[PDB]
Amino acid sequence: KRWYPYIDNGGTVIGLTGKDYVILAADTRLSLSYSIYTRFCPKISKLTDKCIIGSSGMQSDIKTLHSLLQKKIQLFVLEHSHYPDIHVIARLLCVILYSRRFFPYYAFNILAGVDENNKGVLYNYDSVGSYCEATHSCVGSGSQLILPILDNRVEQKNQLIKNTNFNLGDDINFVKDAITSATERDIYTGDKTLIYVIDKMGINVNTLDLKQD
């Protein structure tokens, strides 16, 4: 009778950065409360050659928030004749997100990219204009589950800090391990997931198949 304008379409976006890269992975399932709209709705939209954004909130807001942000970025490129750095984009997204503080986007965003020679970097937001650099972040339905997993392997409470080195290949396998754990433990996590690897030269869109339940 009141028309609450906020629904959660579920899905989780996983971010994990390394010394010279960053891995952004997300599912593709788009679902209503307990039924399923579609089995392939990408939550990750590339922004520049070396900066992509993933959002795991309400899909109507996500489509327009990414579309608004690429519209701003391309407008920035034309007026200033150079692709914005991720720090520039991250700050700009903070303004856009906070520009509607009193009717906030129902989307949680993770921004990944490279700024230095490599310096794999990653930002995470909470629906309103706030961002902190993180070594690993995940948002969405699986945020509650994956974040403990990422902590135990990236940072350490372990007595001896084993696996101090972290090659790119193992980190990809680790995210496939994580995103599969959320799939079989979370209701809304998807069935086909896209894994991005923003390396020095560009981005890969290698796809992984998950459970369909």
């Binding site: 399923i36 509650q144 372990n158 007595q159 001896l160 084993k162 754990s181 209701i187 339940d213």
Partner: protein
């Protein structure tokens, strides 16, 4: 929570999923939602697992006590009158939609109870969150006097329709055949495999911190 059942030529077939959820997440992938009432009648339920699990236990033992004082096998209609009166007293609070099916001196009969105490005799039904998904494939393929084998795999499709299309239902499917002589309850029946299996990586022995260790040996 996708349960279903249908009446066959001389037996009733009950199928159910295996998944219990806190609502955002899943507790276990293997929960026996089928229940033994007597040797010749079985029940499956949905709704809150608290009221659902006790009521079947209360129903099974009342039936068994009845089957002892009386010296005949329990009637399917006896449990329907027993549950619905129990459910009617608690106006709608004991929310548990239950399908119970079995055989008695009459034909193989299946009843769909409802949380408010209403019941109805059906040839086929389905409850839970995936009921609508499971009921669709049931209607498109149900016939009268299906053979046990043919009706058994129809439930497999009936449940798997709710397994895949509904978020709140998933896991293995389990079936019960409630033929006159005895039952056949198959605990695993489906849910295919070959995903990316997690590599087991156990942390080594010298981990943790353990300020104190109060070891003692009992006998």
């Amino acid at each position: 929570t996708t349960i279903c059942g249908l009446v066959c030529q001389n037996a009733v077939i009950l199928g159910a999923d295996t998944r219990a959820t806190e609502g955002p997440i899943v507790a276990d992938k293997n929960c026996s939602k089928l229940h033994y009432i007597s040797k010749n009648i079985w029940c499956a339920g949905a709704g809150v697992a608290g009221d659902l699990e006790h009521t079947t236990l209360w129903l099974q033992h009342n039936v068994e006590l009845h089957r002892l004082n009386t010296n005949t096998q329990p009637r399917v209609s006896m449990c329907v009158s027993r549950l619905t009166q129990e459910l009617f007293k608690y106006q709608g609070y004991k929310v548990c939609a239950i399908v119970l099916g079995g055989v008695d001196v009459n034909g193989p009969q299946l009843y769909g109870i409802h949380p408010h105490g209403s019941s109805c005799l059906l040839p086929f039904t389905a409850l839970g969150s995936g009921s609508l998904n499971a009921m669709a494939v049931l209607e498109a393929k149900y016939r009268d006097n299906m053979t046990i084998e043919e009706g058994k795999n129809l439930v497999c499709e009936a449940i798997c329709a709710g397994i895949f299309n509904d978020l709140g239902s998933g896991g293995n499917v389990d079936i019960c055949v409630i033929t006159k002589d005895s039952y056949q309850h198959i605990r695993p029946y489906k849910e295919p495999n070959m995903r990316l299996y997690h590599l087991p990586h156990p942390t080594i022995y010298p981990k943790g911190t353990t300020p104190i260790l109060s070891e003692k040996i009992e006998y």
